[PDB]
Design a protein around this ligand. Structure first.
Ligand SMILES: [Mg+2]
Ligand SMILES: [Mg+2]
Ligand SMILES: [Mg+2]
Ligand SMILES: [Mg+2]
Ligand SMILES: [Mg+2]
Ligand SMILES: [Mg+2]
Ligand SMILES: [Mg+2]
Ligand SMILES: [Mg+2]
Ligand SMILES: [Mg+2]
Ligand SMILES: [Mg+2]
Ligand SMILES: [Mg+2]
Ligand SMILES: [Mg+2]
Ligand SMILES: [Mg+2]
Ligand SMILES: [Mg+2]
Ligand SMILES: [Zn+2]
Lengths: 139, 98, 55, 165, 102, 112, 139, 43, 8, 68
RNA sequence: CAGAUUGAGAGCUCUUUCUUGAUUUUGUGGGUGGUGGUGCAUGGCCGUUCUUAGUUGGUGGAGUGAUUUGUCUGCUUAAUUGCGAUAACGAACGAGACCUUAACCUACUAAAUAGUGCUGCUAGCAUUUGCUGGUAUAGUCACUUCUUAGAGGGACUAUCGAUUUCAAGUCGAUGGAAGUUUGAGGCAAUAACAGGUCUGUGAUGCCCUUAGACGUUCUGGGCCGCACGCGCGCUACACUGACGGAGCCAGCGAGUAUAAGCCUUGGCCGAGAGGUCUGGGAAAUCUUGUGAAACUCCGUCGUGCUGGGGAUAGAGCAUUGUAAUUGUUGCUCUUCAACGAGGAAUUCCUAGUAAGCGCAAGUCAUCAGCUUGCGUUGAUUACGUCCCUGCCCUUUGUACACACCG
């Protein structure tokens, strides 16, 4: 059937989204999105839904598997996998006119829904406890 | 050094017939693994030989490399009372490869 | 008698239990990957062993 | 015996490092340049580059025969498992190892440094080197020590190419 | 001791000879009608050693960071044991070591 | 912040984020007296305040006041912040960050 | 309805109530004395019910995975120990408490010793946990 | 070699040494009774 | 200064 | 900053004095052209030379350039 | 051997007569070994001036000359890096290029030591054919997106607006994975320092010692010793918090055999620390998704030297090691001190940065409040200047050139 598989990434977290044709099943690691444990960030994954309207997800079901990163870093990876999966499905099984419409609303609200953040942790350098921080100097 | 005559002999039929000897630098080692005697005996017995110009000694990475001089084959020819048919092993004229 | 006393103390699981391959030192030994080399002897042999500075 | 991959490749490198210094101490007078360890089935080919392959292979190859025996008896190798070959370095002027060992054999003979230093500057360039610089530091009859640099031609100093050329 | 699914594990420090031997064996497994699986790029291991620059104990605290990358590749062949071993001697290289396991 | 807005909603019934915008415009000093001392001596001079520094110093002063009011106090930080924002929104001098804003613009008047 | 379709935090509060009201779980005699971890400094505040709630967490945690051991359970419920002046560190939980819970749970059902180590969930373990999920979400 | 001389000869003696030695060495370069039997046959 | 002095 | 160096500035203006008719105002075409005109050791330097050559070409159509 | 002696089952020494047999004992020279001295005799290495941006020759011009210009008024840049002015023209090192790493590739190349969808086989819940799983090294499947890594591609400030000598450039947008040299490093010039190391070297010259040793070894102690001053740090002074339960996410790495014992799951004992029995892993296979900590939810506490804080100490239980006394370390109970946010001064830091927060590797039989890295959560405020401080350049003065430590 009509199946597309995509992925979103944050610092280390990576969420692999599978978007198949169906009744509209949207699960996080086999669990409904209505029960994400970062409760204060539950609307971060609700943003790709309410921006376009839930009617777009009638015909597609989404199952993601998010691993790596941390609690917050996984949420941004998940919301990116969902947003990219919806676009990739439209480009392949729907006219590209609709795909360009959906891509417009997401980008006009938040770039990170479709574009992965390129920031990674700076390496630590000797002479300090951090990337730029240095040991306290004495005279 | 006080080496028994018998243990010193085995040191000589190892430095002749395989005219090179390798000894790890540990004085209390029970067995030099190729001459059934104390490791310290091998170092000090061959320290005399290099002291009297019969073996070259080279030291690298805590290891002794003893090689037999041409003058030392004649010395073991007579002192060991061996036949004057010597050719220990490194002198058997195997000839090099080009 | 004397042989039971000379070098009788155990010399295992200690810093004196091991020594540098090169200089037979006891301080600053490197045991990773079974190098068993002093940190000073390692620097003068690192290129030969196959360790290079990249980053 | 059974050794892990990380500790096995490291052991092969460490074996090379110790073997290289052994030739430098023993064959210093014969212009030892470097060693190449060519592993092969059943045999262990070792190619040594020296200015003089007569001192290593002298008196019916006595030294090379008596020198390969020192490695079988020290690394517990099978007598047939190793073969040593002596190869002449093609371009003696382009090997800094040969040039440094050659300089030592001249400095130890009492020859003046200036005559000795310019003897390697022109020999290196004569072989076709792009550049060469020799620094000699120490004490010579005088109590105070000094260093003198004798450059020639073109030399690069920074970045990866110094590791390449 | 006829046909045999045989695994060859390749490890080395340098990738050019590793890929030449790997490609040469794959090439020789092509003209010979032998089904093959590989090469499989195993995750490279970075053996890192960080020492102090100073042989003594004086100066700014500066460190060297030496590295030794180890790359491992395994190739699966479906051929009799006599055939696979002679392929190894065809693609023998001083840097790369070879172990053959059935 | 989520809890503070609810407290700002039950009090005065206004839109909580409307009160936040009002509290920020009313808390930023419009003229601060920068120092122009020539290597050791006191030589104060009155200068203007940019809109960006005017906005972002209000947020710095609003949060600093809430932090100190909730230290060793039974009132929680969410409701200490709520007390700080409501008072500053209506310009009351009782609130912290309004004493500071007036004192900054007062010193600048004593420099021209 | 499955276990993954109900929030974890209020599912355990419901499974804990059933296991206490069911009464068949055998409770060791030291539950009123012991602390859960060597890193803890005080015993649990819910003296009568803490054992039931922890068993509910262990049962629920094993449901979503495959052959988790008892050593892994100590690491899971362990936390940062409060070393006085030394920095904090993660320390495993008590072995007896976790081993007793799964052993107590094994003759009351839901689990059994799994092949290749660990403790699998039983043939009846899925049947009755999925039941608890249904009696969780009617309100 | 600190003198104003010994650089006259350090250069002229150094360069004629190499020119004589590179050329001399670069033209020559082309070119074109056991033991075990004695210690066993104790018959 | 120093100088190993004996007792036995 | 983005100040080009002399190894790219002089190498780009040698190209204009030698291959002006074949050059153009497009970086992508210039990038492919300089791979068959010059022997560049590194890809990064190839892109750098063509990017400054394009700037000089874009400047030549507006008037005379210095050095060409 | 035995007894005396000794700390000692050291024939070290003394009574004691046995044993071995020219290896060896005494004197001469000569050695040799020294964590003995000299880094103010040296090599090598490292730190520093300084990673600042500086350094050099050919031809030509100036000067008897040493030398100078080139190497500069101005603008620009991280930069002697470029525009430009120009008795200079044309160049080299250093910088930059270069190399490693991190971020992109549904475009190639494959992966049963990676993952997935289907399919066999299989469980629970509503029964609508659906939702979660387990199993799968023969389903002798399909695929390379997530994972790995090799050959490549991609960014060059690209296009468009402003300012500028319309130059080098700079600032804004748009596109873009990336527009601070894309982020971070590695390498790093001409000379030089009485900088530090002979306590890393079987690297060294010389001096000292060399049998009552300053060599080496055994036993025990010390390097931890405590009226005091100072530096690198860790816990904290609470409610933006402590506990008590519950939720539960990383990355960098390491790992053994007849050893002298590695990482250790799983089961079974123990409140814990830990013990025991099996098994996996020389490793993308197993430890390991290292289910880490901060963190989030629900509760107790309620401004109290309080459930903050956990020194000091008593008693007890384990581990490592020949050996824990001057507690190696871990665990249990009790004891619960200063500290209620810190003067004059002073350090580090501009984006996945600071700050927290843990985890791994090094040292390691045992011990990390230390370093080297890694990831989790993740900001405020400039994006400017020479006011302080340090360095560089130019001009200038000089009785200095061993160069003001003159
Ligand atoms: Mg000179
Ligand atoms: Mg560079
Ligand atoms: Mg465990
Ligand atoms: Mg917990
Ligand atoms: Mg010095
Ligand atoms: Mg001139
Ligand atoms: Mg001028
Ligand atoms: Mg900087
Ligand atoms: Mg910077
Ligand atoms: Mg002692
Ligand atoms: Mg420090
Ligand atoms: Mg808590
Ligand atoms: Mg042990
Ligand atoms: Mg200044
Ligand atoms: Zn060493």
């Amino acid at each position: 059937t009509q199946s597309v598989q995509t992925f979103g990434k944050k610092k280390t977290a990576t969420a692999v989204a599978h978007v198949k044709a169906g009744k509209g099943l949207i699960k996080i690691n086999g669990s409904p999105i209505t029960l994400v444990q970062p409760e204060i960030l539950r609307f971060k994954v609700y943003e790709p839904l309410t921006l376009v309207g839930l009617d777009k997800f009638q015909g597609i079901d989404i199952r993601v598997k998010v691993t790596g990163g941390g609690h917050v870093s996984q949420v941004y990876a998940i919301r990116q996998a969902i947003a990219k999966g919806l676009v990739a499905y439209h480009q392949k099984y729907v006219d590209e006119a609709s795909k360009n419409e959906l891509k417009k609303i997401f980008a006009s609200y938040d770039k990170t829904l479709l574009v992965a953040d390129s920031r990674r942790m700076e390496p630590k350098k000797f002479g300090g406890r951090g990337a730029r921080a240095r040991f306290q100097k004495s005279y | 050094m006080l080496i028994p005559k018998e243990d010193r002999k085995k040191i000589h039929q190892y430095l002749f017939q395989e005219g090179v000897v390798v000894a790890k630098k540990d004085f209390n080692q029970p067995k030099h693994d190729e001459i059934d005697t104390r490791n310290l005996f091998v170092i000090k017995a061959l320290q005399s030989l290099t002291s009297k110009g019969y073996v070259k000694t080279q030291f690298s990475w805590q290891y002794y490399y003893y090689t037999l001089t041409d003058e030392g084959v004649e010395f073991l020819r007579t002192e060991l009372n061996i036949p004057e048919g010597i050719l220990p092993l490194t002198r058997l004229k195997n000839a090099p490869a080009e | 008698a004397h042989e039971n006393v000379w070098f009788s103390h155990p010399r295992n699981f200690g810093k004196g239990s091991r020594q540098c391959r090169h200089c037979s030192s006891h301080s600053g030994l490197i045991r990773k990957y079974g190098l068993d080399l002093c940190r000073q002897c390692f620097r003068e042999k690192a290129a030969d062993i196959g360790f290079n500075k990249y980053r | 015996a059974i050794l892990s991959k990380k500790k096995k490749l490291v052991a092969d490198g460490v074996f090379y490092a110790e073997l290289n210094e052994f030739f430098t101490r023993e064959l210093a007078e014969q212009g030892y340049a470097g060693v190449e360890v060519r592993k092969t089935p059943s045999k262990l080919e070792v190619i040594v580059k020296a200015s003089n392959t007569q001192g290593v292979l002298g008196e019916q190859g006595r030294r090379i025969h008596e020198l390969t025996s020192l490695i079988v008896k020290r690394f517990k190798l099978s007598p047939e498992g190793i073969a040593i070959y002596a190869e002449r370095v093609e371009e003696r002027g382009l090997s800094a190892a040969v040039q440094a060992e050659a300089l030592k054999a001249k400095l130890l003979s009492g020859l003046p440094i200036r005559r000795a230093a310019y003897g390697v500057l022109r020999f290196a360039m004569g072989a076709g080197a792009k550049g060469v610089e020799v620094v000699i530091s120490g004490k010579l009859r005088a109590a105070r020590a000094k260093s003198q640099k004798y450059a020639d031609g073109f030399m690069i100093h920074s970045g990866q190419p110094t590791r390449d050329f | 001791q006829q046909i045999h699914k045989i695994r060859i594990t390749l490890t080395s420090t340098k990738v050019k000879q590793l890929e030449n031997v790997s490609a040469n064996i794959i090439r020789n497994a092509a003209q010979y009608n032998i089904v093959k699986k590989g090469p499989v790029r195993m995750p490279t291991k970075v053996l890192k050693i960080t020492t102090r620059k100073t042989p003594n104990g004086e100066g700014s605290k500066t460190w060297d960071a030496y590295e030794m990358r180890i790359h491992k590749r395994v190739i699966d062949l479906q051929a009799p044991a006599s055939t696979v071993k002679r392929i190894t001697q065809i693609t023998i290289e001083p840097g790369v070591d070879v172990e053959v396991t059935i | 912040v989520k809890h503070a807005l609810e407290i700002i909603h039950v009090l005065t019934e206004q839109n909580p984020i409307q009160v936040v915008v009002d509290a920020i415009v009313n808390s930023g000093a419009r003229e601060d007296s920068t120092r122009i001392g020539s290597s050791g001596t006191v030589r104060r001079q009155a200068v203007d305040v940019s809109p960006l520094r005017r906005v972002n110093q209000a947020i710095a002063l609003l949060t600093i006041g809430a932090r100190e009011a909730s230290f060793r106090n039974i009132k929680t930080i969410a409701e200490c912040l709520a007390e700080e924002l409501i008072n500053a929104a209506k310009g009351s001098s009782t609130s912290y960050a309004i004493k500071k804003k007036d004192e900054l613009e007062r010193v600048a008047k004593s420099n021209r | 309805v499955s276990v993954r379709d109900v929030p974890a935090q209020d599912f355990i509060n419901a499974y804990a109530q059933f296991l206490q009201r069911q009464g068949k779980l055998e409770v060791p005699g030291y539950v009123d004395i012991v602390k859960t971890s060597a890193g803890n400094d005080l015993p649990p505040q819910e003296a009568e019910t803490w054992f039931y709630k922890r068993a509910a967490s262990i049962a629920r945690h094993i449901y979503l995975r495959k052959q988790v051991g008892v050593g892994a359970l100590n690491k899971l419920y362990g936390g940062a120990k409060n070393r006085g002046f030394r920095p904090h560190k993660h320390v495993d939980a008590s072995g007896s408490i976790n081993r007793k819970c799964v052993q107590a749970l094994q003759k009351i059902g839901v689990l059994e010793i799994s092949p290749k180590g660990g403790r699998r969930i039983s043939e009846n373990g899925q049947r009755d946990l999925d039941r608890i999920a249904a009696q969780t979400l009617e309100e | 070699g600190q003198s104003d001389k010994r650089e006259l000869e350090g250069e002229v003696e150094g360069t004629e040494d190499a020119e004589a030695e590179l050329e001399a060495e670069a033209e020559e370069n082309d070119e074109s009774y056991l033991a075990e039997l004695e210690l066993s046959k104790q018959e | 200064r120093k100088k190993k002095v004996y007792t036995t | 900053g983005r100040v080009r160096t002399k190894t790219v500035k002089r190498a780009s203006k040698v190209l204009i004095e030698r291959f002006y008719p074949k050059l153009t105002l497009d970086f992508e075409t210039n990038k492919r052209l300089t791979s068959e005109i010059a022997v560049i050791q590194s890809k990064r330097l190839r892109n750098k030379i063509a990017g400054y050559t394009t700037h000089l070409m874009k400047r030549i159509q507006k008037g005379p350039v210095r050095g060409i």
